[PDB]
Design a protein around this motif. Structure first.
Motif, PDB file in Angstrom:
ATOM      1  N   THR A 111       0.819  -1.206   0.000  1.00 54.35           N
ATOM      2  CA  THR A 111       0.000   0.000   0.000  1.00 54.35           C
ATOM      3  C   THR A 111       0.856   1.260   0.000  1.00 54.35           C
ATOM      4  N   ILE A 112       0.454   2.239  -0.812  1.00 53.83           N
ATOM      5  CA  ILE A 112       1.063   3.564  -0.810  1.00 53.83           C
ATOM      6  C   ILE A 112       0.371   4.403   0.256  1.00 53.83           C
ATOM      7  N   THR A 113       1.158   5.106   1.066  1.00 49.54           N
ATOM      8  CA  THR A 113       0.653   5.915   2.165  1.00 49.54           C
ATOM      9  C   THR A 113       1.341   7.274   2.165  1.00 49.54           C
ATOM     10  N   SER A 114       0.845   8.161   3.028  1.00 50.87           N
ATOM     11  CA  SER A 114       1.419   9.496   3.163  1.00 50.87           C
ATOM     12  C   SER A 114       2.907   9.468   3.514  1.00 50.87           C
ATOM     13  N   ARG A 115       3.388   8.425   4.198  1.00 55.45           N
ATOM     14  CA  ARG A 115       4.824   8.351   4.475  1.00 55.45           C
ATOM     15  C   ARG A 115       5.643   8.140   3.206  1.00 55.45           C
ATOM     16  N   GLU A 116       5.102   7.423   2.221  1.00 58.81           N
ATOM     17  CA  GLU A 116       5.821   7.248   0.965  1.00 58.81           C
ATOM     18  C   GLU A 116       5.879   8.559   0.195  1.00 58.81           C
ATOM     19  N   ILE A 117       4.797   9.334   0.234  1.00 59.58           N
ATOM     20  CA  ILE A 117       4.790  10.633  -0.427  1.00 59.58           C
ATOM     21  C   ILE A 117       5.748  11.589   0.268  1.00 59.58           C
ATOM     22  N   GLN A 118       5.733  11.622   1.601  1.00 62.73           N
ATOM     23  CA  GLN A 118       6.636  12.511   2.323  1.00 62.73           C
ATOM     24  C   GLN A 118       8.100  12.173   2.059  1.00 62.73           C
ATOM     25  N   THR A 119       8.444  10.885   2.020  1.00 63.21           N
ATOM     26  CA  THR A 119       9.832  10.523   1.747  1.00 63.21           C
ATOM     27  C   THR A 119      10.215  10.842   0.303  1.00 63.21           C
ATOM     28  N   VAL A 174       9.020  13.235  -1.500  1.00 60.97           N
ATOM     29  CA  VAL A 174       9.187  14.685  -1.535  1.00 60.97           C
ATOM     30  C   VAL A 174      10.540  15.092  -0.964  1.00 60.97           C
ATOM     31  N   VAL A 194       6.592  19.960   2.939  1.00 62.48           N
ATOM     32  CA  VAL A 194       6.215  18.992   3.968  1.00 62.48           C
ATOM     33  C   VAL A 194       5.249  19.604   4.982  1.00 62.48           C
ATOM     34  N   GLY A 242       1.714  19.801   3.196  1.00 64.89           N
ATOM     35  CA  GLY A 242       1.034  18.514   3.166  1.00 64.89           C
ATOM     36  C   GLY A 242       0.568  18.045   4.534  1.00 64.89           C
ATOM     37  N   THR A 243       1.383  18.266   5.569  1.00 61.82           N
ATOM     38  CA  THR A 243       0.974  17.856   6.909  1.00 61.82           C
ATOM     39  C   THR A 243      -0.249  18.638   7.372  1.00 61.82           C
ATOM     40  N   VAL A 280      -3.428  17.292   5.413  1.00 64.08           N
ATOM     41  CA  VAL A 280      -3.891  15.993   5.906  1.00 64.08           C
ATOM     42  C   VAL A 280      -4.488  16.103   7.306  1.00 64.08           C
TER      43      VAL A 280
END
Lengths: 108, 80, 93, 96, 96, 78, 108, 93
Positions: free
Chosen positions: C57-65, C67, C80, C83-84, C87
């Motif tokens: 699964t793709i999650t917000s942690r994958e997007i943050q990393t 970025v 960052v 986005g935080t 969300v």
DNA sequence: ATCGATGTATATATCTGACACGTGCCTGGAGACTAGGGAGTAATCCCCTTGGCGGTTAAAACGCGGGGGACAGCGCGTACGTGCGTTTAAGCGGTGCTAGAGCTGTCTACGACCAATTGAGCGGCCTCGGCACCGGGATTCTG
DNA sequence: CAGAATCCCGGTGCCGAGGCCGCTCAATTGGTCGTAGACAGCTCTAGCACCGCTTAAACGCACGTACGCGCTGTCCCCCGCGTTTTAACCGCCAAGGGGATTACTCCCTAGTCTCCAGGCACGTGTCAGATATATACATCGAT
């Protein structure tokens, strides 16, 4: 049945969270997509869009024009030490070049 | 054919002027023509390859955008 | 056929940043290409980060990393936070 | 009659062409060159009006960048005139 | 007495080091440098024995290529001694 | 300050492998700065991959991935 | 229930068609994978492997050795104009450089 | 636990090209990473070709076009020749 | 024309640990059948690509005068290379500790898949004012 | 310091950007349910620390020669200006090849179950390569 409210209005964004979620599903990047991914990606894309348009508008104002044209986008990107690093391998149609002459070539 | 001679001396001078060159040696023209021909050949081979895979007969702007993208240079304003 | 584009959203942002200024069709085409470019770059790195950890699964942690890996230091530092905040407000609603 | 000294006009041309934005190669000759090269790969091809413009923009950007690199190589040797070896050195370091 | 002329030993060293394949930087001093740089990002990090070897191989492979490029731009100026401006020109043309 | 551990003889040996015959006295301090700048960009990425996995040990694969992202594919370490 | 036999034996290849087919499906490259894709990709990978090993084995004999080592792979790649173009960005550990001295540096 | 590598197939090829030569474990590791690299390049380009045409499936046409785009002029002709030979032998078995 | 002092390489014997092979077994590839929707084929519309004519000025081709740049030669003075004696700390072999990477088990919170509903945003149309072109005046900069 | 080049200002006028309308298909709300992954506990690999010793490599000094740099001379090939000519650019008219779409239906791939053999850890042993010694013969610098 409750009255519908868009996800962008819940998050406060202008970009479409629904379209981003659709594109994430159709691209086969992974078999599952979490609910938080599209809100984060939409917020980042909106930030970078506004960050570029502000400098382009300032360039258009300095030239005493009212409509932004590709020349102003080129002048905006190439004058910023961080935008120029992210977009170094990109060529913009009708952008031209920045004025620059080597000091050795000018007359005494 | 003679079509390579269509890239005249004045056009090469104008390009060199945009790049800031003040004085140009008389042998630069044939060298520039040789440098340009290999670039065109490389991009066009890829463009025609994409055109043939689609079974089309017309070469479109997207085939060019994808070719340039593969060579490692990105063009903004024509699509994609 | 009907073609989708970001033109209306870019215009809404422009009207927020500079109400008196306008934009030509060519500039809109450039902006419409820039958005798809960065979208594909971030989704690509988020996908690689998922496979290296055997996650499905793709999650917000994958997007943050992704970025933090793609954007330069100050741009990543601000993006960052944006986005935080987005969300957090979405989840609190 | 009044005559400008050698080089006075060259700087003026540099300023003129750095401030402008139009294309500099003639359209018809370039279009014929493009249609000639393509004939080696496939016969009876057809081209859209925008593909030629995309190719022309890419070629002019490439050549301007190569001349920008060549001028630094000329100054390093304390010369003013650019010469073929400057192009060959720039291309060798770029890895082309 | 006996003494070789300047430059013969340098050529013999060139022929020596282009034939061998061992690493040329001291392992322990390099390891301490890697430990010192990483501390600015996170504390109490640990490193696998092979990570330092991968870093050392990458750094030496980078520096050899940079010196290869610098020598050509030294010869272009009709010199034989390499100088800082040759490195600066090579890095500028390489775009780094 | 461990940058001084990259000694002058080691730099000369690297220059010899590269074919340099004669070396100017100021090359050493320029080379130290170039290497120091190169190492930081790789270590920052390796640590980023280590932190995403919540590990405390930096691993060879983190370095392999950090280098590949820059276009410097390394064969031999898996 | 006839006696099972491998697809590689039917195609006449040494590489594993079944493993390649599995790896394609597990990568999410597309939702469907045709029957001929793995046989074609296996044949291509076998060809490039045999070419590399042939040149490395010839380089081993030129040094009176009987075992291939990374140095022989480096010399095999860097001496072929086709393989060197494909592997221009790759770094091989323990490979070293090729011998080369500029003519200007040799004695008068 | 159990790993997976191509060392068996690489050794089988080696004994066909040179039945009198052996290979060290360090060289085998490089040969093992080489196949994984080229495999990922070809599968990547084949996926892009399928996406641009709006197709759901990957076929030998995508593999052949990816090979013609990725490999140089002389390697491409031979690789395509034996790929088609292998497919013809499989389909005629 | 060559000597002779240094250096690199080759030929023989001894050792050791890296490579090639065989065994046990388990989990992943092959055989057989069913269901359904993706791709292949044929037909129609119409749009945009190729081909031609007339004609007028913007741009390229050809000459020539001269001056300022590229190149070779010379002198000089100090930066770097070669070789020696001294001293620093890298490399190695051994032992011991414990932090943390890798795995199994339980279970519950998350995301995918259907169905019904309606409004967000895309295509076609209108129009008016931002921009560009012409001509004349003001200021700058050069030989 | 005369005069050639660039900029700017007032007037004309047109077609590109801003705004409206119709409407349909993509997004939302509500429900079920299967399994991905979060947490707790355990094993035991391998990363970190300390010690003693030998001697390989780094450091500091002297000296002398080969290189880098600045100056002078000269000659020839670029630049700037003028005349002639050639083929680029614009505008208008024809026609038909090929791109894009719709409707039908069939054959290709996904999925489930069984079952059995390919290839992955583990153990063994013997010979290819590493090393020490002796010496051959090639090269460089001075006479």
């Amino acid at each position: 049945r409750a009255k519908a409210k868009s996800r962008s209005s819940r998050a406060g964004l202008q970009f479409p969270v629904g379209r981003v979620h659709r594109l994430l599903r159709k691209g086969h990047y992974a078999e599952r997509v979490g609910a938080g991914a599209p809100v984060y990606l939409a917020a980042v894309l909106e930030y970078l869009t506004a960050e570029i348009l502000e400098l382009a508008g300032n360039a258009a104002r300095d030239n005493k024009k009212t409509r932004i044209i590709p020349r102003h986008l080129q002048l905006a990107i190439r004058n910023d030490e961080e935008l120029n690093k992210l977009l170094g391998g990109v060529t913009i149609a009708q952008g031209g070049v920045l004025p620059n002459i080597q000091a050795v070539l000018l007359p005494k | 054919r003679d079509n390579i001679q269509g890239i005249t001396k004045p056009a090469i001078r104008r390009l060199a002027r945009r790049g800031g060159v003040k004085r140009i040696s008389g042998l630069i023209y044939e060298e520039t023509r040789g440098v340009l021909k290999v670039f065109l050949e490389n991009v066009i081979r890829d463009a025609v390859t994409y055109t043939e895979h689609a079974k089309r007969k017309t070469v479109t702007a997207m085939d060019v955008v994808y070719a340039l993208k593969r060579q490692g240079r990105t063009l903004y304003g024509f699509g994609g | 056929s009907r073609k989708e584009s970001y033109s209306i959203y870019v215009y809404k942002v422009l009207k927020q940043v500079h109400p008196d200024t306008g934009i030509s069709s060519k500039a809109m085409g450039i902006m419409n290409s820039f958005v798809n470019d960065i979208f594909e770059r971030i989704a690509g790195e988020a996908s690689r980060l998922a496979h290296y950890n055997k996650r499905s699964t793709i999650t917000s942690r994958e997007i943050q990393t992704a970025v933090r890996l793609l954007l330069p230091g100050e741009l990543a530092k601000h993006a960052v936070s944006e986005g935080t905040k987005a969300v957090t407000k979405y989840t609190s609603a | 009659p009044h005559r400008y000294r050698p080089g006075t006009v060259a700087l003026r041309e540099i300023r003129r062409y750095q401030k402008s934005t139009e294309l500099l190669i003639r359209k018809l000759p370039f279009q014929r060159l493009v249609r000639e090269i393509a004939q080696d790969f496939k016969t009876d091809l057809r081209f859209q009006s925008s593909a030629v413009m995309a190719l022309q923009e890419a070629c002019e950007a490439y050549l301007v960048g190569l001349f920008e690199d060549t001028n630094l190589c000329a100054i390093h040797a304390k010369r003013v005139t650019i010469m073929p070896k400057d192009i060959q050195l720039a291309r060798r370091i770029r890895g082309e």
